[PDB]
Design an enzyme around this catalytic site. Sequence first.
Site, PDB file in Angstrom:
ATOM      1  N   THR A  28       0.968  -1.273   0.011  1.00 52.11           N
ATOM      2  CA  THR A  28      -0.114   0.178  -0.081  1.00 52.11           C
ATOM      3  C   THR A  28       1.117   1.207   0.171  1.00 52.11           C
ATOM      4  O   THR A  28       1.790   1.362   0.811  1.00 52.11           O
ATOM      5  CB  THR A  28      -0.946  -0.013   1.018  1.00 52.11           C
ATOM      6  N   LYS A 140       5.673  -8.613   2.875  1.00 51.30           N
ATOM      7  CA  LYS A 140       4.326  -8.284   3.060  1.00 51.30           C
ATOM      8  C   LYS A 140       3.254  -9.293   2.141  1.00 51.30           C
ATOM      9  O   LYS A 140       2.792  -8.977   1.172  1.00 51.30           O
ATOM     10  CB  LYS A 140       3.931  -6.967   2.397  1.00 51.30           C
ATOM     11  N   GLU A 173       6.268  -5.936  16.398  1.00 53.16           N
ATOM     12  CA  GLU A 173       5.679  -4.795  15.391  1.00 53.16           C
ATOM     13  C   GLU A 173       4.466  -4.381  16.233  1.00 53.16           C
ATOM     14  O   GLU A 173       4.108  -4.891  17.231  1.00 53.16           O
ATOM     15  CB  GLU A 173       5.648  -5.303  14.119  1.00 53.16           C
TER      16      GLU A 173
END
Lengths: 269, 269
Positions: A28, A140, A173
């Site tokens: 993204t 990802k 994270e």
Amino acid sequence: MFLINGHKQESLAVSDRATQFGDGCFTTARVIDGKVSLLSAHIQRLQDACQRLMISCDFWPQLEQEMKTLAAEQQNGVLKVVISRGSGGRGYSTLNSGPATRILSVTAYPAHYDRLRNEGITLALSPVRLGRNPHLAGIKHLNRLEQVLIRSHLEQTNADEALVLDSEGWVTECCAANLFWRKGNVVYTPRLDQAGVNGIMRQFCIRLLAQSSYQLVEVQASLEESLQADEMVICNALMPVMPVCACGDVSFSSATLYEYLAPLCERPN
Amino acid sequence: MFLINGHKQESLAVSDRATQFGDGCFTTARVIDGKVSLLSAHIQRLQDACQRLMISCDFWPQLEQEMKTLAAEQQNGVLKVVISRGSGGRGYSTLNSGPATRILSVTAYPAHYDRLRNEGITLALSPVRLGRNPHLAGIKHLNRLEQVLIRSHLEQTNADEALVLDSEGWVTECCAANLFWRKGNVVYTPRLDQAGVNGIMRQFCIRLLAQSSYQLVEVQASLEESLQADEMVICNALMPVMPVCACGDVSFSSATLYEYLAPLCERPN
Ligand SMILES: *Cc1c(COP(=O)(O)O)cnc(C)c1O
Ligand SMILES: *Cc1c(COP(=O)(O)O)cnc(C)c1O
């Protein structure tokens, strides 16, 4: 509206292995004044994901053209790209499957960000812990049920993002962002060789910090270690950086690292 | 041809969260002489998966009708059902998403099975190790990239299925099947509270073994322990049980447990 393999399509073949097994990757990206920020990093991260997933594509220059065209149309917003193995193969096997699917779309830039930028982020420890698997770590990829569950538990709090550990208890994270914390002149970030997404903004920031007078260390750290920080900052391609006011009842008083990174990431550089 | 939310559709909305995040679950069932074997176990396993994923559905009696109708049409084969959260929600959040998607389809019964039944299965240790996450363990969810990678490494051998360990080194399962091994009168199977799919056939077999004179134990075992077995057997809804001739250069000489389970699973019971 989506642009799929070159033409407009609202729907996708049901047999696509994205739908069946999450067999693919995505990015993204931020769109500002008609241009994709960090465009070559986004192409490179997709290339890297596909390589580690054995998804062979040679449409890269066409994907790049398509990303530029959609960005110019949207002018300001978010551009999302999905690549999947395509349809085919028996059971889980990738033999005789393909060719790859590419999917692009764009949306306006989300409201709440600004709010969060100007008010600061609160973090809550997630009860959901990431599995460790170096074969998928960093990428990802589309297998994001862990993040759906993390988000769901996060919403039962007054926190805006989560602090996420792996199955061994190491700080890894956030839900959809990466994490840096500072003690003194030393800036720490988790190593993502066992779990986590190695974000585009994380790599940008590491580059900055590496060249900066700060010392940057990638570590394996316990939540107790991370909580003794003077400052926390989180990042992703879209925010791109946000300051952390607290993680629980522990508060952070400084914004010096945030103040330093935000102008160089916003441009970006 | 697929039956999606009640009507025939070849394609699915691109925004569906199955496509985007693998946000959902599935089952694959055997069809024999026009009927779904173990039909209520398949409904129950889907219900359980959706509950653990917070996917609320009340279409169960309709899904059951649809499974029966497709089974009668196909007469002999495999029936696959996918349920996903549906479209919607911001980022990973499930808020305002839905309603759920149901997807059904059927195929003929695959060739190679018979071959494998009559020749015996060879197992190869996978270099890919499953992450441990009790929040997802046991569920047949759509996040199956780990299995795609396992299959891919398996194909570089002369093995028909894989022996898969988790990140701690404990024997967990195969690529698309569950694993039992026997020493003497005691029959062992991995506990799947940290990783693995708790298969429909595994539960059937545990039920059988529980009531049988064999002793059945669910364990946490090292690959070295499992390799000292007198016999290995693997299972899934479709095989349904297969005998294991070897895992590497270690061979197995007995088929007594296989001989016992195969007639009761084939009916099934
Ligand atoms: C996308 C994402 C990030 C941040 O990635 P960027 O490339 O910087 O946007 C961090 N964590 C997860 C789980 C992500 O999905
Ligand atoms: C589906 C599956 C099984 C076996 O499940 P059954 O319900 O018996 O078919 C075992 N392992 C994995 C990884 C599976 O996908």
